[PDB]
Amino acid sequence: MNYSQIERMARKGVAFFTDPSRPMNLIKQGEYGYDENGFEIPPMEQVIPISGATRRPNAREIDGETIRASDILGIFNNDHEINEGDYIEIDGIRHVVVDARPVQASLEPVAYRPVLRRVSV
């Protein structure tokens, strides 16, 4: 079976349920390393734009301390591959990609369905 046709269908479907006014960025900080004593920071941010769709909002409850946090799920495109420790800048709010969950039956996955949790607590 042809996977290019599936890629085109997935791209058009993602472009259907999307709004071209939500600012979404992506952070790929990496290449860390410790000093000869243990003092160093990763000097990479690598902010790039991205667009997609979101669904299923959910609220965070920890101890009844009224922290008022939330987390959602998203659907994205194949370019700018997502990893297991990246950050997503959704409407000025950072989320961490806990799960990548590519929609994959072949190499070079057609799309990604990451699971995002709000950063900090």
């Binding site: 479907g13 259907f16 929609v103």
Partner: protein, 133 residues
Amino acid sequence: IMNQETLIAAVEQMRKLVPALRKVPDETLYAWVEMAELFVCQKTFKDAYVKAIALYALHLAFLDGALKGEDEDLESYSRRVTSFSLSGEFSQTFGEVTKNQSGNMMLSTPWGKMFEQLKARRRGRFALMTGLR
């Protein structure tokens, strides 16, 4: 075709009717219009020739899907997709827009119907002839 400004006017009229063609490469539109010029008569209209060319080209480019662009495989020209879903994220269903049980091949798109009406108003849909000598 006989010269260039008529081609420019025809392409501009097609883009004016359908703004979605402002992104299509120009050469493809040129090829489509110069191939659709073969079916239209200049002596019949002789006043709205560019409009007739634009209408016929638009109708000819939209019969069953022909102007599909690049990177569309070859199976798309023989079968159509009616449904597509992605896991439990979203789903979508398509369908045919017009029924053409008449089988004229010109009452399949609105552009074809408008062209038929314009031809009927200008000259007519009849062909009455008799043998020579």
